[PDB]
Amino acid sequence: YCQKWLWTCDSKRACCEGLRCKLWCRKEI
């Protein structure tokens, strides 16, 4: 689900739940 976390969901894998695939995935609220 996640993308290595702190990595740009794409060349590795999609983004996790809540994360922001915009530019780079990362925890947020």
Swiss-Prot record:
Localisation: Secreted
Coiled-coil spans in chain: none
Superkingdom to which the source organism belongs: Eukaryota
Tissue specificity note: Expressed by the venom gland.
Disulfide bridges in this chain: 2-16, 9-21, 15-25
Modified residues (Isoleucine amide): 29
Note: Negative results: does not inhibit Kv1.2/KCNA2, Kv1.3/KCNA3, and Kv1.4/KCNA4 channels. Shows an extremely weak inhibition on Kv4.1/KCND1.
Domain notes: The presence of a 'disulfide through disulfide knot' structurally defines this protein as a knottin.
UniProt family annotation: Belongs to the neurotoxin 30 (phrixotoxin) family.
Function: This gating-modifier toxin shows an important inhibitory activity on sodium channels. It is very active on Nav1.7/SCN9A (IC(50)~0.6 nM), and also shows activity on Nav1.3/SCN3A (IC(50)=292 nM), Nav1.4/SCN4A (IC(50)=2.2-159 nM), and Nav1.5/SCN5A (IC(50)=2.3-2.9 uM). It has also been shown to inhibit tetrodotoxin (TTX)-resistant (IC(50)=27.6 nM) and TTX-sensitive (IC(50)=30.2 nM) sodium channels in rat dorsal root ganglion neurons. Lower inhibitory activity has also been shown on potassium channels: Kv4.2/KCND2 (IC(50)=604.2 nM), Kv4.3/KCND3 (IC(50)=425.1 nM), and Kv2.1/KCNB1 (IC(50)=14.3 uM).
Protein name as catalogued: Beta/kappa-theraphotoxin-Cg2a
Organism, as annotated: Chilobrachys guangxiensis
Parent-record interval covered: 54 to 82 of 83
